[PDB]
Amino acid sequence: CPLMVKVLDAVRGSPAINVAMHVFRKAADDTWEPFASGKTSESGELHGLTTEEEFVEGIYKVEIDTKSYWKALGISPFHEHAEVVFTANDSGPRRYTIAALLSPYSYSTTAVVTNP
Amino acid sequence: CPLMVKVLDAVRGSPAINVAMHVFRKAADDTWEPFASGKTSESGELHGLTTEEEFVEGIYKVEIDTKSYWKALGISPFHEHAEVVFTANDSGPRRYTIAALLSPYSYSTTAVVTN
Amino acid sequence: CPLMVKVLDAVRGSPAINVAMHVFRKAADDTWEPFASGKTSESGELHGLTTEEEFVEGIYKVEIDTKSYWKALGISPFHEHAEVVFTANDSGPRRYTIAALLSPYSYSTTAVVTNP
């Protein structure tokens, strides 16, 4: 469906497995409303967060719990989390893949936006 | 200078100049209280945000207005901003350089943490 | 199969399509021998470069023609190409995904190495 997140580990060269993340939508009143959540699979992917009709226009935030991921590996990393904040579907529906690449003191994030 | 931010532009191969950003400290009630801000210099750098005495342990957020930067260049961006959230000084004062590399649909951020 | 390359465009937020690349293997005599080549698909992927039995231990180089990609979009980029040089299969066979993320003056590259 319309929103997928793929998370890689740049130290081990592997998908980043069991990484928790929470998705929020900015409300009319400017607050962050809980939208969805899940944890990455063995392939570092999280699918099924939302549907085409629920995923309307708006500003979305994906908060990826990268600190817990590193802590479980014994590492105290720099970032509390990796955030990804973006306007979605403002020219009509699109399908978003959020790619995140994680190191203890660095994190990249990239979007692949395609038309269904 | 305990906190410095350096921003580069991966499309133009240059420092990212006049990029605004705000720094926040997480309050006891878990809200973000803004306490410093600035814009990058002609070398893409922002210095002088805080002092050693002020920069106590806590959770800090740097919100970099990448969307305005790309809009000023006439380039469509993906992100609303780039946010850098970290716990500072957890075993003593350190000097933090946040290095941010910007593309319209991608950014990376790195910390260089010294003495 | 054992070697896949996925190339993304960080300016347009899209797969980088029709990107040419050449794979070389370092020979016993230290020269770079042509190993395989291909161009990325509409999904920014190149598959079928090699087989499990051909892809023996050795030092491999993937030379991705990123300059031509940017030039065809009107852009004069920094890099002549993005190279990816690595020892493969030295603890037994593995499956390698090379992920490359391209901007006119920057390029990241990451490997996902998994056991079949």
Added chain:
Amino acid sequence: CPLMVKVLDAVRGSPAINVAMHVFRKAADDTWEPFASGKTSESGELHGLTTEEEFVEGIYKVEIDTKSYWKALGISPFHEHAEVVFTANDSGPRRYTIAALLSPYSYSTTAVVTN
């Protein structure tokens, strides 16, 4: 200083120190002729590789020995090295900073190209 290389370590959040690298210029017969080398300082920087007069147009390669760096830290790396291949000075002399960010299974490289 027409060419500077700055290398950071994404695992330790620090400059990458004592990283060796070699610089080559592509010859007329398409072989690479080595002409400069050095290792990064305690701030992860390598200066003084060439001079304005020597650094003429051509295709240059910087080969960064990331594998030795990771081996010295006891960390398994993926890449044999990180190579930065570019045409220099194509419309006049510029000042190039190559910024490299290193992880064991990933690296990124960026050019900051000025006047």
